[PDB]
Design a protein around this ligand. Structure first.
Ligand SMILES: OC[C@H]1O[C@@H](O)[C@H](O)[C@H](O)[C@@H]1O
Ligand SMILES: OC[C@H]1O[C@@H](O)[C@H](O)[C@H](O)[C@@H]1O
Ligand SMILES: OC[C@H]1O[C@@H](O)[C@H](O)[C@H](O)[C@@H]1O
Ligand SMILES: OC[C@H]1O[C@@H](O)[C@H](O)[C@H](O)[C@@H]1O
Ligand SMILES: OC[C@H]1O[C@@H](O)[C@H](O)[C@H](O)[C@@H]1O
Ligand SMILES: OC[C@H]1O[C@@H](O)[C@H](O)[C@H](O)[C@@H]1O
Ligand SMILES: OC[C@H]1O[C@H](O)[C@H](O)[C@H](O)[C@@H]1O
Ligand SMILES: OC[C@H]1O[C@H](O)[C@H](O)[C@H](O)[C@@H]1O
Ligand SMILES: [Mn+2]
Ligand SMILES: [Mn+2]
Ligand SMILES: [Mn+2]
Ligand SMILES: [Mn+2]
Ligand SMILES: [Mn+2]
Ligand SMILES: [Mn+2]
Ligand SMILES: [Mn+2]
Ligand SMILES: [Mn+2]
Lengths: 409, 409, 414, 408
């Protein structure tokens, strides 16, 4: 086990190293505790939900098991966070379909969130259903298919409004559609006009902003839908800005070499807010667990340096069933927090002045030196201050949870 | 030398092959006639211009030489086209800088365009000048630098309005800025806010759309400016939609594997018009001569299939000084025209129906068969009908122009 | 329907256009006749095989798959080959991958003989309980390695037997899924286990006239994204050092990577290639091959540099969203017309112009050739080999749909 | 200025944190000492050289360039090496690339001995009238080919001489620009011309104790985008078959390509690697090396699989927008701290966990190690080797600017 005295000693020296270069480590930690991460429920049960019943043991099979697993992960993540629901995580003994869901079907999660002390975000479920016709939903050329998914869309807003009212925290309602073509399309225009019309119909009925606002998630390509995506990043950025809604940036859904941290400063002169879905793509939209890599470092430092956190909701989105599913959440959440914290531990005001004076020598030297400053000592202090295990130690908690809970399922 | 009667005969056979699948070759050729390509003047003199005085022989060094070279290229490109000027192509014996150019400095090109029977598009020159400070111009942190380039931007609009008034054809005034950083920036927000404020000042003074409209050209990266581009594709699409201006898509300026033909149908539900700069990137923004490849085939078929040509200006943008510079124009122009014509020779209405009906088997079979239909016979007929040489034959014209003009320089 | 005399007339005009630039269309069509494509059997039944239990009409039995391949080959002009997978064994004896016998392929030998096609082979190193954590031949578990080495050796014995019976060398292609989903600690040891296992598999000598092995690398696959044990570098090195063939699958490389670049860097050192034409759409998606930059460059790089006599061309794709028989024909025809376009260029003169650094002539002529009447030569090739021209083969597909594919699911299996 | 006591206190805590997970920080630092980086001379003078006559203070003479490399090496902890180019010959004699003599490098042999560093070498096959249509050794023109083959042979004679005088093997790296701007018709013949020419260059036997050749491929370059005669495949094949070294330049591969994948596919067949660490930003841009995914993966792949003893690590970048001496130090320190972080992992235990398919433990530990106190071990290494800690070496740069660079 890490000795708390070692943490305190390392922190006192780190505090002085940072103070020497004009950085306040105590202030950086206060800034970090103001950034809630929206932990996605679907990593716990391989996106099965409850509506329509070499993988690691101990998958959650019930609301109680999934709630318990999220409680365990949150207990190992320092600070206070949020949970993202999917529509298929409805808890009810009533026979429901996606077009007949009712807000009270989420009373279970409202009660859980109040007891756990977390806010809730929402996702409509526009996949894994017989009404998905040729990979299309809201923007299907089939009117019956459109109407079914438009009803689910409107219901996602009603559920979100209800949750937001009960919780007293705004529910970000994220729309992701699979709609697209496997092979090269003739008509790229009409599907996007069908999408535009359908989305306008979904958001028409006004709901209190204090309770919910919608975000729209584009994708470049998906398995079986490689050649064309109706809901493109350009379509949704244009839609978000014109309809005054949020734009969802999923770090896994762009071109090879594409840096999503570039988009923030091109959006905020025109738009309202972002839902930043941190996700690790490995050569495709693979939904690997978020790790501390160039992409995460750039996302977190671009939000911190340019002051966009107050208008950017950070959500996790990944699905890895090859490892302990509770551990997956903690790895991704801690990777995101330590990357935000490293960005907050820079003399940003002074680095900005140096850059304004075109002192590119100083900027290169200092940014490179900061990568080996004692940021880990500040992160360890943050973990310890918030009653979470330091470094390797939380593996003990996972091993105990496996023995007592997961391996017994 | 190809025989006119044999071109006519091969056309009659192709006309019947196409008629049998519900395609009218005469109507396809009439559609191609209505698509003017904006031929860039700067390929003729390696972007030297006239304002501020190993490779293929015969570079143009004077207005008369460049005017003559463009006349020769257009004489080998069938139909009616346009020419793009840069501000540095001003023709005047007065001492000028970029912030003191006057509309009359382009009387030479107005007079030439009238005689040649072509319209003119325009480009402000925001590069190769001592006032480019650390690769920044309009969005420089230095107010003196900003104010200089804002004067040039306003002047570009005044010139463009004057040319448009004199020719009775709208001048598309294209803005490209090099502004960015070689290495990783601290502040991505402020440069883009400086750009937004400076562009708004440039376009403030009202001018009639009849004479001129501005287009905004983004870039991912350039040589010596690799890490950050102030004027991003997202920034300019947002800017164009917000300020009711045109958006410039340069085929060479996107990510590896990025398909710019995807963007049109995501723009036109929101925006006014496009300036499509066809350009061949080979692994970077290399500005190779446009050839008939996947990118050009996808750009041209996406414009004709979805009916965007009436709102899309097509310009050439490439620079290859390793080959006959006049030949470079004709290769690129002809590649673009035959690609448009091939797209126009598809049974688009029936293919759209098959696709709406999810007959993806029919769509794959027919689109693949069409690639080996006799589109060549229709292209040859188009060349001959418009008094240009067929196939290899225009090499004789290039060899004669080399002997008589280029090799004597 | 296109009229034969019209095809004949357009061909005469095309022949003259090409003759005027020093290209012989009759000779180009004779050259294309000599390039057999190895049509992959597994597109017909979604890689199910017969060993282990969306568009209509999937093949469910040997006779159904044989019929579907016959139908596809009847619409592809010229003489071709078929690739088998080990799981396409035909026997009532209970078999595992480590107990297959050469005679289990007598069904396919007899079919190939009467169809007039050669056979290529693929060992099956996937969809089996003995795939342990995505690893087979190069598993750290010696019991798993030993099982897959037994299958490897058997693939060679089967291939040797088929080659003996057909009197045509069987290319026996090895593809392993082996790798990691996430970032590995040890990249060296898996590749040493792979090297040792492959050397054991190829140890027993078999006559080259009957069979030779090819080795197929991959950059990444679904659920194995971060590390592939059998990399392109590993297998190019392995093929050259062990004097075997190297398999290049056009879908298995980096974004923007041009596999047509590899041939001329391999052939100064190596024996031969198995070129697997496949269309990747932003990942290893196994789309049907179409006439695109990649196929045009692969085919023209093989033709221009004279590599066809040392390069086996196979198809590898899997699209079950469309008529599975039509999938084969689209891909085969796209590959043939792309080869034919490359053969219809004044290659000797273009080479001389390039050696003289006349890049102007090279650019103008290569661009003009893209709109020469290559279609008229392709149509003539189709007609001469008793296959429908242009859109016409859709009639054949529609007939096969009514008669076979739209009924098949209701037909008793046997 | 950082207090040595702050470095010592942080180090003692770091040493305990690493010991608790089976990692010896003292041993990790001893391992790092054994990895010399070959510092490229051409960053100091924008690849001008002396044979054929932006931030202030460019080196313009051999003494200025030598002084600048001394200054950079004084701020990089441990013992390293310097890479020369043929155009850095120091002689009063009129030379061309085909008439250089070994003693034209006596200046650099003497400097290397005084400095206490080994020397690697690069033939110069660019920026010369005899570069014809972007081709040199593999030109279709026999006059061009023969000129560049002579330079190739001389590069080996020079390398052998330097190696004999220093008592340290000179890696002689070959990079050719040869290729086409636009799409070629014949891809085969250029590569056969290259094969024959390289075989002629390496024909005359020279002692391996003095020098060995390495061959550097490229995917594409400016004005040569469509085809590169000397491809990565061509040179890996050539190195393995002719028993020479293969040069991997981190800036010269495809978008998303991980050059750290190549080592374990090479070493079952090949002799050795020259690894050129270089940062590409969307093309072969030759940016200063920084601690990024590419550098982290390169360094940890060499450390984890035990390839350092068969892998020469060289720097290759050119950034004239910043202090050129600082450029060397940023790049060298980034490479060293990345090697050190890789050396500070419980590699033997992580390998066992991975063999047992415990991918949960592997993910958790590799992520935790990224925020272990690796910086405290790096600072101790800097201090132990008499170099400034953290931001402090900027004082040295500012003093060197004041006293030397800005006075030029
Ligand atoms: O809704 C959960 C996620 O499911 C994946 O399949 C989609 O690609 C989106 O990333 C989405 O956010
Ligand atoms: O090596 C794995 C172990 O490392 C120790 O340092 C931790 O306290 C945990 O017990 C963990 O399970
Ligand atoms: O041709 C048969 C197919 O026709 C399409 O129009 C239908 O959508 C189904 O895909 C059906 O199986
Ligand atoms: O809903 C299932 C149907 O999906 C279509 O796309 C397939 O082509 C088949 O017709 C299938 O029966
Ligand atoms: O339009 C589709 C049809 O085109 C005709 O030209 C073909 O002969 C086939 O009948 C095909 O089914
Ligand atoms: O010769 C020094 C370096 O110069 C660059 O221009 C080349 O691309 C190679 O990377 C070479 O190693
Ligand atoms: O202004 C002419 C052109 O110059 C350069 O190519 C720029 O990258 C951009 O494409 C611009 O349009
Ligand atoms: O076995 C047939 C094929 O199956 C999969 O597509 C593999 O990725 C590989 O391409 C192999 O050749
Ligand atoms: Mn997402
Ligand atoms: Mn995803
Ligand atoms: Mn442009
Ligand atoms: Mn460009
Ligand atoms: Mn394959
Ligand atoms: Mn594949
Ligand atoms: Mn290099
Ligand atoms: Mn480089």
């Amino acid at each position: 086990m890490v000795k708390p005295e070692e943490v305190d000693k390392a922190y006192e020296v780190a505090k002085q190293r940072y103070a020497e270069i004009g950085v306040d480590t105590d202030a950086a930690m206060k800034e970090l505790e103001k950034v809630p991460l929206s932990v996605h429920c679907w990593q716990g049960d391989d996106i099965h939900g409850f509506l329509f019943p070499g993988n690691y043991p101990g998958i959650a099979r019930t609301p109680d098991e999934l709630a318990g697993d999220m409680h365990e992960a949150l207990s190992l993540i320092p600070g206070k966070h949020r949970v993202q629901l999917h529509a298929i995580y409805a808890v009810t003994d009533k026979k429901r379909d996606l077009d007949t869901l009712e807000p009270e079907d989420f009373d279970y999660w409202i009660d859980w969130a109040k007891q756990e002390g977390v806010g809730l975000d929402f996702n409509g479920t526009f996949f894994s259903h017989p009404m998905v016709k040729d990979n299309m939903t809201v923007s299907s050329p089939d009117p019956k298919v459109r109407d079914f998914w438009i009803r689910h869309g409107k219901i996602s807003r009603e559920i979100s409004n209800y949750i937001g009212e009960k919780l007293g925290s705004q529910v970000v309602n994220n729309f992701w559609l699979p709609d697209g073509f496997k092979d090269n399309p003739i008509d790229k225009k009409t599907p996007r006009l069908r999408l535009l019309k359908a989305l306008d119909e979904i958001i028409k009925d006004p709901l209190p902003e204090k309770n919910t606002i919608e975000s729209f998630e584009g994708k470049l390509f998906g398995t079986g839908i490689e050649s064309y995506t109706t809901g493109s990043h350009e379509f949704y950025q244009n839609y978000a800005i014109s309809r005054n809604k949020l734009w969802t940036i999923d770090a896994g859904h762009f071109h090879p070499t594409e840096d999503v941290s570039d988009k923030f400063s091109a959006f905020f002169p025109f738009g309202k807010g972002l839902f930043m879905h941190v996700s690790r793509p490995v050569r495709w939209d693979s939904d690997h667990v978020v790790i501390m890599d160039d992409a995460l470092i750039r996302i977190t430092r671009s939000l911190v340096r340019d002051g966009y956190l107050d208008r950017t909701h950070i959500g996790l989105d990944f699905f890895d069933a090859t490892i302990n599913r509770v551990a997956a959440w903690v790895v991704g959440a801690r990777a995101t927090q330590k990357s935000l914290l490293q960005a907050m531990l820079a003399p940003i005001d002074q680095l900005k002045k140096d850059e304004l004076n075109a002192d590119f020598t100083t900027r290169l030297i200092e940014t490179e030196e900061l990568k080996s400053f004692p940021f880990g000592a500040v992160w360890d202090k943050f973990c310890q201050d918030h009653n979470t295990p330091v470094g390797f130690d939380w593996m003990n908690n996972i091993h105990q949870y496996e023995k007592d809970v997961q391996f017994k399922r």
